[PDB]
Assembly symmetry: D2
Homo-oligomer: 498 residues x 4
């Protein structure tokens, strides 16, 4: 059989010589009997003296934590990131310090809208989160399998999720909400194409690329700053599943990705990704035709060729899923020196959003969990107390800064880059920006005839369920993108409606 | 289209005349703009002054509560319970006070092992929970579609769930755990048959019966007590789905039951159940061949004919799923006067288990939620404070009992029945009780040839994935139940393994 | 006796005619007996069937919520705010709409460092929080009895609290931490004087003034904006307690303020405050000698005379302290239209800090608690779900914005004021600003000889416990403020040390 | 100065050679500057990019956990328990395995009604909780400075606390509630005397005795069982504070006990307690004049002499109060083999009450906190997951029992003692039991004239604030206890009321 199905058996093989441990309660008290409870005779009521039963039932009653609001379904793995090229001119981060340096990494793949028990082989963008354990703390690169996103303004992200999730009343998926939101927000059209192409349903997590959608900032030792885009492309090749195969796998094996990744890692076929960066100077950003910080746009390779950096490899499956995968947290705000945020609005929203939900669902001290703990760095600060504070709470050291008792001191070298920003402080509308030129390029050049036909068919099949005026608005947007695109969509919708 | 898909449209039709409300924050402050955020110019960073954005994102980050440890996937409805016959001789409860009395009820159907996003059309026992709003408080009748259960000892319930759920490491369903637990616990064999028969996959919640598996105690005005079993049988008839149809629906519509129930209630086809009780006297309990409090056994109809009581009808869909279905809590300990627990161990375990998990996942004051609040009874007690205590916290009334300031007083008439229990206080083993006679009767008499063949085929198909020795133990147990049963299972397993 | 001690008796007088209510559980089930538990005979063990006992004990176990990190000890009252003058030229807020308008208000007084059981009559700044229930939501004016504060940078606020609170190891008040922090941060000197003057220990909450320390922004209908400072001065007159009297009251009655306020309101002697505002134009802000947004500085009355607005009156004691005082939350971010924040850094920090701690200690939906609920405004938004979500969760309305189904729409008239800000984005040091001129003015002109002598004596008495070098640094700072001040402090410290 | 006030200085002396550590965020990222925030120019608004500020403020906003519903104010210490005598005939517990065995212990003293910032030198019973780290898990002996308690029925405990705590409306201490509850429940009279005697205000935690109020059950290797009462008496001697001195200390130093204990341990003057047990056989329990499981009664020394066992010593102050004292949890249900509960109702109530509140205020996995973790025992079970589950969550081991994959197995030797209990299952009233004979003995024999006079004066001073009929009922109960007692109380109350 496959290794996963033999997991317990392998465990039994590891402890074949060792004797079974003595059963205990939470406090370590041995248990005389766990197959039966205390009663007043053979057919009497239960008693409170059965402390072991109460402890077991109470802990069983509290095994569930709140699921992630998005990306609930997921798989996890661990490995290393290896540097193969020198980019010290662009950044001063310790991860890129020198060639050959190896940094431990924790990786989690996920699906956006699927809940905890949702199937994996469905049409949905795939989230790809990486956590590097560097000497200067944790670095969280939380991207997707797509270099762009539906929207460019953070405040609309919740509503978008509410559109992609179940109806508040019927608790059913409502295509009307999805297509109404997309039609009212044509900026998503680009991503929509990427969603309904062949890449929408990858054949496992090992056969899909990963992109850092946002543009970040890289600062070198001399203080020079350049904007950057992160990419990581799979070395196993791109492979996609047909719609029929995806439905068959969903009915048969909803956990196709988890099983595939686990068996691949166990058998030694370690997946790998090659890491690239695109670099943009401030002058290029000023002269860029579009807004370089727009999450809906991409940097063309011809103007901004990929620059290799290193390689990602995964070589360890989780020992316990809940401890190492369910409780793992990726905060994009964890950026070490040499890497800083950009004026991209979506990134700014994520910076606040992620730690807040992590504190809510995992706890205020979630960072001290072993999977999220920067075990390669020394954490010394003036944060004290907190629920479930493990360790020694930094002992009896002074808890106020500044102080005259040799407490931790700030490091001036880790300051942030300073930039002059013009314009008045207010709300600027970005819905009228260009939303069709790159989509037109993708439709015309990147895709061949067969891919275009499949794209149109899939979009029509999903959109037939929506109401008429929503279909008309979506077709209008597609026609603005390209006439033949909208005409094909309209013909397919007419066929479905008839 | 179906009503559910038109839900929002119907909402728009209700407020066609009414003007749209003004958008506000949580505190009621009007929002100038929600499509954009505050930045330092067109391409500047985000500011903390955007309080509306922080509020929206913080609330979005906290939309998820812990799912139910079991019965996570579910559907909800509301209606009334109507009395059609007089059983005042058996019980004094206000619900059975007189003929024609109507009591509001809230009903929730669920599947045991399926998580939040799990499909409905799968082979799994169906949970059926009812909450009656009586003048003497809430009555929670929390049964299943089966009158029995796999085990008879509460302390084994968590492990059983751990066997029916994902592997701790791979996060995959492991048939090895399930069949190892069942083989080591042959008492489940009875339920296993009920699980693998045609009833294992009902065609929606409206075409399955509901049973109160435990035996309870009914006390009349004169203090006489009799044990009872609750039943509620569907008036729409029993209908089951084939395995192929179930898989097709799971791949197509994981929410088949929710959609079916919602559309049926919306269109006016209100489902109905007829309510019955079996009655046992204490002398009959003493002379019963088996233990009458064993959850694995049933009371034969011939010796204990069904006695009609009333009828259940559902005629209202939830307005909001999360408020009325996700946050609803059924505590079996909520038993009004005239209904009391039995010495059945499993019921005693549930009595403590349910309120504990409810306090954990919903909050200490979960009972004050409108769906769970006994709005037909006046709650006056000496419980004070608590997180998120709504209402007035009973004002400035005295908070200590006894007192000399006209505070609430106990009602002696609501005392419990007193019974003399013999035997010493210790742990009594119940694994050696009879586990094959009723299973043999069910296999031989109740089931016809086709049902027996389908049962054997389904059991073999599920059990082929397990290891060899587990198969041998399960086949041994089936042979103990009946020779032909085990022989057919063994032949099918040999075919699958070959 | 005083009314408070007769509270229960008065309750008994209100329900003299009414019969005592029937005791019930949380679910409304009547309780047969609450004075005794269920046991196996007179001297047997306890049973799980005693559901009432488990419910009562479980709720008793969960009566405590996390106390406020600061301002834990407090008193509460309710009343109205009445407008007496027209300031529509400065602001467009509904509270100042027209003369004679009355707005419900909830008021809470507190002491900063005192914990829940801490005494009230101690030397500590007094927090004064007001919550106006306006048609445009809640307005939270959260000031103190002092118009300034120790620090001007938000990031130092936690450490300051850690200095004013117990040692991490010994759990004792450490004057070394307090005076080390103050000496290292001479900007606090101003506030320190205000702390050690006669006002440091007010004779109850009714004999102290209240100030809105931060400068806010007022916007009129025409879009013109002006900075403002809020004041509310007591009509009962300023009255202070001697140190000996304060210690005597602390040993006798730690709840002196609560009792005083409760009895005053019950007897009809309603306390009152007169509301004033200072107004600054943008030109004046540019030409102001200091930074007008510095929390350590004040606006002189001669240059910026007080302008009366209205009056505050309290006329209702809490019915339940925990529901109406412990669970009340004041978020400064709740600012209706016409009132906006300033570039003061401390205010910006508070804007994020307060709702976060409120969500932590009260819950994500704390705003829906009746005391904090804007019952005079209609809350319509796209926030859904959440733990312990009461009401109907906005029903089945659309949960995504924008939408085409008549959902709530934004109000453009409630937009924020736009201002051009110059300078580069970085961290600017503010520790070198002026810290002695206003302190010198306060020491020389405002205070008479007796007040100066008492100030020096109190400061020396508190500072004698600190180490020598801390005393030298503090004396150096005082000498920088004024020579005689430091000389008197040094002489007193020499006397104490000798 | 005293060591406590020099604490930080001593810390500075320990790291005099070591260089200051680099300041970091929660994730370990170095902080460029912590004295200032990011703004749009010198006088601009705050930005979200200041992640360090948001992290610090968010953690500061979440430094407070729910305080204990009772015994909020407290002090903590650590040390060892040493066996000096052999009682293996009575119990088989590993702590009493052999003479000279030393077991780590964590001790917490507390005051019942005082909140977190409440003063220590007040008239209130003192809670004394001990946690032994034995090879067979944790043993929690959670007693008080008194061998008895006000009530004997668990269901009345919350109301009693509600009487001893602030009014729901005024948030003030109400003597009316306290004395109404005590008068309606005369069974508390015994404890009331113990509360209003000189022992009501001990001169620190080092000068008071500690008692295990409940009667427990001790089982030996051969299965024989005997009931027991635990005692631990201070070796420093009993010392009490006068009312005037107590008020003076409360106004001056509310943390008198904490400071005293910390300085005593730091200076080397380690406090000590001698451990004793009273033993009762089942026949003696049957023939006992009262109910031996009544928490309101005591076992006379003459009939049941004290039997020494060992000694308790404290020799380590907490490194961090919050981690080691605020988050410490004592569950009486943590009883290793050889020690079992009795049919005492109050103990049965505590067994369920304590872990529930601990799960509420500390978290479902509070037992894995280092102070509460049985680091001297191996915890292997089928409990999985849970919020903030540290360690490895027992790895990928099987999570269902029984199983055929070499998972942890039960130990039959750790079974509980079996006893036949007679009588029908119902609610039995215990309010009519004897409530005056032992109180009369305590008033007449144990106390001298001066102690009796001070007791009467203190009771009258507290009770004068109550309403008239409450005073009459309390005086009636005292007269039932003894005539002169009630007469003195009535005369003092008349004097106070006439004022
Ligand atoms: C303003 C825009 C966004 C917001 C507010 C947001 C919010 C969130 C939240 C609240 C979570 C829950 C994480 C947890 O509970 O552990 C999450 C997870 C995640 N998000 Fe986003 N999201 C946004 C856009 C994006 C973008 C643009 C990407 C990638 C290009 C992305 C990729 C992910 C991934 C991969 C996860 C998985 C986290 C994990 O596995 O622990 N999201 N996001």
């Amino acid at each position: 059989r496959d290794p996963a199905s033999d997991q317990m058996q392998h465990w039994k093989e590891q402890r074949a010589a060792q004797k079974a441990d003595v059963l205990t309660t939470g406090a370590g008290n041995p248990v005389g009997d766990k197959l039966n409870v205390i009663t007043v005779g053979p057919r009497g009521p239960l008693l409170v003296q059965d402390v072991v039963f109460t402890d077991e039932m109470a802990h069983f009653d509290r095994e569930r934590i709140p699921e992630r609001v998005v990306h609930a379904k997921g798989a996890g793995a661990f490995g290393y990131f290896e540097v193969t090229h020198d980019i010290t001119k662009y950044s001063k981060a310790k991860v890129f310090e020198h060639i050959g340096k190896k940094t431990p990494i924790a990786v989690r793949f996920s699906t956006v809208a699927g809940e905890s028990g949702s199937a994996d082989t469905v049409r949905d963008p795939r989230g790809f989160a990486v956590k590097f354990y560097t000497e200067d703390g944790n670095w969280d690169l939380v991207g997707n399998n797509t270099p762009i996103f539906f929207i460019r303004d953070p405040i609309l992200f919740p509503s978008f999720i509410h559109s992609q999730k179940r109806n508040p009343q019927t608790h059913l998926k409502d295509p009307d909400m999805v297509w109404d939101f997309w039609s009212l927000r044509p900026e998503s059209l680009h991503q929509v194409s990427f969603l309904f192409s062949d890449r929408g349903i990858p054949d496992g997590h090992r056969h899909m690329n990963g992109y850092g959608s946002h543009t970040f900032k890289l600062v070198n030792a001399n203080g020079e700053a350049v904007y950057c885009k992160f990419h990581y492309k799979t070395d196993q090749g791109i492979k996609n599943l047909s719609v029929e195969d995806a439905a068959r796998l969903s009915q048969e094996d909803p956990d196709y990705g988890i099983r595939d990744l686990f068996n691949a890692i166990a058998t030694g076929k370690y997946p790998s990704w090659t890491f690239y960066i695109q670099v943009m100077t401030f002058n290029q950003a000023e002269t860029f035709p579009f807004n370089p910080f727009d999450l809906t746009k991409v940097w063309p390779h011809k103007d901004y060729p990929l620059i290799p950096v290193g390689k990602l490899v995964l070589n360890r499956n989780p020992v316990n899923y809940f401890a190492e995968v369910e409780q793992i947290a990726f905060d994009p705000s964890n950026m070490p020196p040499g890497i800083e945020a950009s004026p991209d609005k979506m990134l700014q929203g994520r910076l606040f959003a992620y730690p807040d939900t992590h504190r809510h669902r995992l706890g205020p001290n979630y960072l001290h969990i072993p999977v999220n703990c920067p075990y390669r760095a020394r954490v010394a600060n003036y944060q004290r107390d907190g629920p479930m504070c493990m360790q020694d709470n930094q002992g009896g050291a002074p808890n106020y800064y500044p102080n005259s008792f040799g407490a931790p001191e700030q490091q001036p070298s880790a300051l942030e880059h300073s930039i002059q920003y013009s314009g008045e402080v207010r709300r600027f509308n970005t819905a009228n920006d260009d939303n069709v030129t790159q989509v037109r390029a993708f439709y015309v050049n990147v895709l061949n005839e067969e891919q275009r036909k499949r794209l149109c068919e899939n979009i029509a099949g999903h959109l037939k369920d929506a109401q008429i005026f929503i279909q008309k608005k979506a077709v209008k947007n597609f026609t603005e993108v390209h006439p033949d695109y909208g005409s094909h969509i309209q013909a397919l919708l007419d066929k479905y409606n008839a």
